[PDB]
């Protein structure tokens, strides 16, 4: 089963809480946060299979808004990371993310499988969608690995 646009997914990263790893889910309601309204769909325009190096939108299902890298750096105590949040507007590059493999055992232009560990690169700011500690998401120079499950 490959990953496709319009398929409702949960977007997860591993966090190391009490020296204990668990899978956390991206959520939102105007910035983004983590939990475990966690439902997302990949899109290519305002159910095609996604390829690595494809730029995509992440549409939040409850709200209908998109995950966009912001200007501001207010959620972070690293001032080189940008805030990530929901935006209704989708002209410009800020709501766009390119998908990359975690592993060398996956190539650019290849089909993105479910259960593939993913790296998500902001088109406008060239930063990664990034897990930060509470736990939040920002856009930073350090990579975080994301995986997608069906929901």
Swiss-Prot record:
Homotetramer. Can also form heterotetramers with RYR1 and RYR3. Interacts with CALM and S100A1; these interactions regulate channel activity. Identified in a complex composed of RYR2, FKBP1B, PKA catalytic subunit, PRKAR2A, AKAP6, and the protein phosphatases PP2A and PP1. Interacts directly with FKBP1B, PKA, PP1 and PP2A. Interacts with FKBP1A and FKBP1B; these interactions may stabilize the channel in its closed state and prevent Ca(2+) leaks. Interacts with SELENON. Identified in a complex, composed of FSD2, CMYA5 and RYR2. This is Ryanodine receptor 2. It comes from the Eukaryota. Residues 47-102, 109-151 form the MIR domain. It is found in: Sarcoplasmic reticulum membrane. Belongs to the ryanodine receptor (TC 1.A.3.1) family. RYR2 subfamily. Cytosolic calcium-activated calcium channel that mediates the release of Ca(2+) from the sarcoplasmic reticulum into the cytosol and thereby plays a key role in triggering cardiac muscle contraction. Aberrant channel activation can lead to cardiac arrhythmia. In cardiac myocytes, calcium release is triggered by increased Ca(2+) cytosolic levels due to activation of the L-type calcium channel CACNA1C. The calcium channel activity is modulated by formation of heterotetramers with RYR3. Required for cellular calcium ion homeostasis. Required for embryonic heart development. Coiled coil: none annotated. The chain holds residues 12 to 217 of 4966 of the full protein. The calcium release channel activity resides in the C-terminal region while the remaining part of the protein resides in the cytoplasm. Disruption phenotype: Embryonically lethal. Embryos die at about 10 dpc, due to defects in heart tube development. Cardiac myotubes display enlarged rough endoplasmic reticulum and cytoplasmic vesicles that contain high levels of Ca(2+). Channel activity is modulated by phosphorylation. Phosphorylation is increased in failing heart, leading to calcium leaks and increased cytoplasmic Ca(2+) levels. Highly expressed in heart, lung, cerebellum and brain. Detected at lower levels in adrenal gland, stomach, thymus, esophagus and ovary.
């Amino acid at each position: 089963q490959f990953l496709r646009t319009d398929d409702e997914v949960v977007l997860q990263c591993t966090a190391t809480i009490h020296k204990e790893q668990q899978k956390l889910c991206l959520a939102a309601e105007r910035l983004c946060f983590l939990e475990s309204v966690e439902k997302w769909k990949f899109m290519m325009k305002t159910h095609r299979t996604l390829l690595y190096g494809h730029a995509i939108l992440l549409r939040h299902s409850y709200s209908g808004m998109y995950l966009c890298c912001l200007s501001t750096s207010r959620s972070s105590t690293d001032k080189l990371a940008f805030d990530v949040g929901l935006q209704e507007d989708t002209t410009g590059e800020a709501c766009w993310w390119t998908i990359h493999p975690a592993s060398k055992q996956r190539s650019e232009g290849e089909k993105v499988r479910v259960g593939d560990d993913l790296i998500l690169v902001s088109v406008s700011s060239e930063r990664y969608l990034h897990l930060s500690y509470s736990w939040h998401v920002d856009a930073a120079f350090q990579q975080t690995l994301w995986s997608v499950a069906p929901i």
